[PDB]
DNA sequence: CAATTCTAAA
RNA sequence: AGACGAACGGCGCGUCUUUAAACCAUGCGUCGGGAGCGCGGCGGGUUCAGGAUGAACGGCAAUGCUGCUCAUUAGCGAGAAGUUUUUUGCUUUUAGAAUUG
């Protein structure tokens, strides 16, 4: 977005939480039947 | 659609449909074709030209 | 460590473990995996030390 | 879609190794948030984690 | 190995009649006890709980000696109860976290003392240990003015404070912290006997558990899924054992490993 | 070391 | 010949026969809604209370309802058919040989 300097550190753990939208559970993938 | 591909990789039998990929000439190359060489694996039938 | 003779750094497999667990129940905090040393470094302090 | 997996045909597919690695981690997780939900004994959590 | 088991269970035994003696040696576990009897309200029982009510209150009216010896015959006459596991659980649990505070304050006091002036572990243990309470460590401490000891008058009196709300606490006991420390340490040494008896008898019983659960193989349910239920199994059915029984080991378990591995393969296969 | 062919191994 | 399959429809297709079920399980397949604001509100969550369910709620929100006004898409290259449709699209790297400036 038109940046000037890139600042790189450690991620704590609330900012891990502020990237993300929501958790992961399920190891499963696809419907199977359908590719859904 | 589903409980075909599932199908397709436990035994399938796909439907006689045709593709085509006939050797065309590359592009910007002129010719005149002198000789056509036809090669068969034995025990094959063979062919008109052969 | 507290006031039990015990050494903030030292390692202690798990038979000198069971022994120091006779010894000594309390005071000789026993944390094992990850949470051990996660737990640790929020004990140090950095300015002092520095 | 930086770890895409291919739908090829069916279970086979044409992807970054990611989905395989993600998806033992999250066994592995599942598993021991199942031990720590029935208070099994130290050596069993001890080899889960 | 029935001396495993048997050892086991008589030294629990032992642990949880020290940490009641104890229990009986300490004010406010007695408080508590008696407060929570009075709202859970068996003649015997009831003859047994007058006797209590009697003992306390000649005890606490004698503070001043034979205490000792009052405080050994409220040890034998205080274990013919049988104690039930949530109560047993629960005191135990509230004198732990007692006993939790207790080490919040040390913990608090020797930060004070140990890297803000980086004090020599040998010689604090050797001198502060003891008394706890008085100049001894206060200003006796700068008495000698060795090199640790003129860098603490800038926090003598955060020692101060903070030790005084020691003693707040002590009164909150009621028992000097010299003899709280004693008794605390006295039932964690019980308790230490106790975690290092399921600790032999889940290291020992390893071999055993493992050797019931090989009779399953071709299940279907993952080698691991068959050990770690049938050890969870095992432990629960452990948990009450009973080692009057002539049976051996592996007939107090087929059951309980059949079921949980039954619900395995029902539930995740 | 930029291409331009050809061959050979995955 | 009709019916149902998270809201509507078209078509696909499963089952049933005058009935809305059943099956299944982020409850099936696939295209479509010139317009933005307004009206209420399917559906789906929150709070409360009841003791297994009742009430209220508006972040949002379907089929619809009375109105105010902003103006009309597309990967690339081959190929086909008739301003409109339609097919196809790379194992690239690792070496080795010869030749350019
Ligand atoms: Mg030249």
Not at chain 1, 1 to 27: C, N, Q, T, Y
Not at chain 4, 10 to 15: D, L
Not at chain 5, 70 to 88: A, C, G, N, T, Y
Request: include cysteine; glycine fraction near 4%; aromatic fraction near 8%.
């Amino acid at each position: 977005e038109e940046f000037d300097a890139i600042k790189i550190a450690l991620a704590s753990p609330d900012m891990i939480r502020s990237w993300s939208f929501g958790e992961v559970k399920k190891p499963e993938t696809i419907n199977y039947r359908t590719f859904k | 659609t589903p409980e075909e591909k599932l199908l397709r990789a436990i035994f399938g039998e796909k439907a006689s449909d045709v593709k085509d990929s006939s050797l065309r000439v590359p592009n910007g190359v002129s010719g005149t074709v002198i000789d056509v060489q036809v090669f068969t694996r034995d025990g094959v039938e063979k062919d008109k030209r052969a | 460590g507290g006031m039990t003779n015990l050494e903030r750094q030292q390692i202690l497999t798990e038979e000198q473990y069971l022994d120091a667990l006779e010894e000594f129940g309390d005071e000789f905090d026993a944390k094992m995996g990850a949470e051990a040393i996660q737990a640790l470094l929020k004990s140090m302090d950095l300015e002092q030390e520095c | 879609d930086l770890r895409p997996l291919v739908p090829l045909d069916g279970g086979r597919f044409a992807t970054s190794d990611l989905n395989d690695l993600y998806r033992r981690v999250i066994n592995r997780n599942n598993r021991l948030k199942r031990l720590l939900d029935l208070a099994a004994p130290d050596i069993i959590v001890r080899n889960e984690k | 190995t029935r001396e495993g088991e048997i050892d086991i269970a008589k030294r629990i035994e032992d642990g949880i009649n020290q940490v009641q003696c104890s229990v009986a040696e300490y004010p406010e576990a007695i408080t508590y006890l008696l407060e929570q009897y009075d709202r859970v309200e068996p003649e015997l029982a009831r003859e047994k709980f007058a006797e209590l009510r009697a003992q306390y209150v000649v005890t606490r009216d004698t503070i001043k000696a034979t205490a000792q010896e009052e405080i050994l015959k409220l040890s034998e006459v205080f274990k013919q109860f049988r104690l039930v596991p949530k109560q047993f659980d629960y005191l135990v649990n509230s004198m732990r976290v007692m006993m939790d505070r207790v080490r919040t304050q040390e913990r608090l006091i020797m930060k004070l003392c140990v890297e803000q002036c980086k004090m020599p572990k040998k010689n604090f243990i050797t001198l502060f240990t003891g008394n706890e309470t008085s100049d001894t460590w206060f200003n006796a401490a700068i008495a000698m003015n060795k090199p640790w000891s003129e860098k603490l008058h800038d926090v003598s009196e955060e020692v101060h404070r903070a030790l005084q709300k020691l003693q707040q606490i002590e009164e909150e006991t009621g028992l000097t912290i010299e003899q709280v420390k004693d008794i605390n340490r006295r039932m964690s040494i019980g308790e230490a006997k106790a975690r290092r008896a399921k600790k032999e008898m889940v290291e020992a019983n390893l071999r055993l558990v493992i050797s019931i659960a090989k009779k399953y193989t071709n299940r279907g349910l993952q080698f691991l899924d068959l050990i770690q239920e049938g050890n969870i199994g095992l432990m629960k059915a452990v948990d009450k054992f009973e080692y009057r029984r002539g049976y051996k080991f592996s007939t107090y378990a087929t059951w309980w490993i059949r079921q949980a591995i039954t619900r395995s393969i029902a539930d995740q296969a």
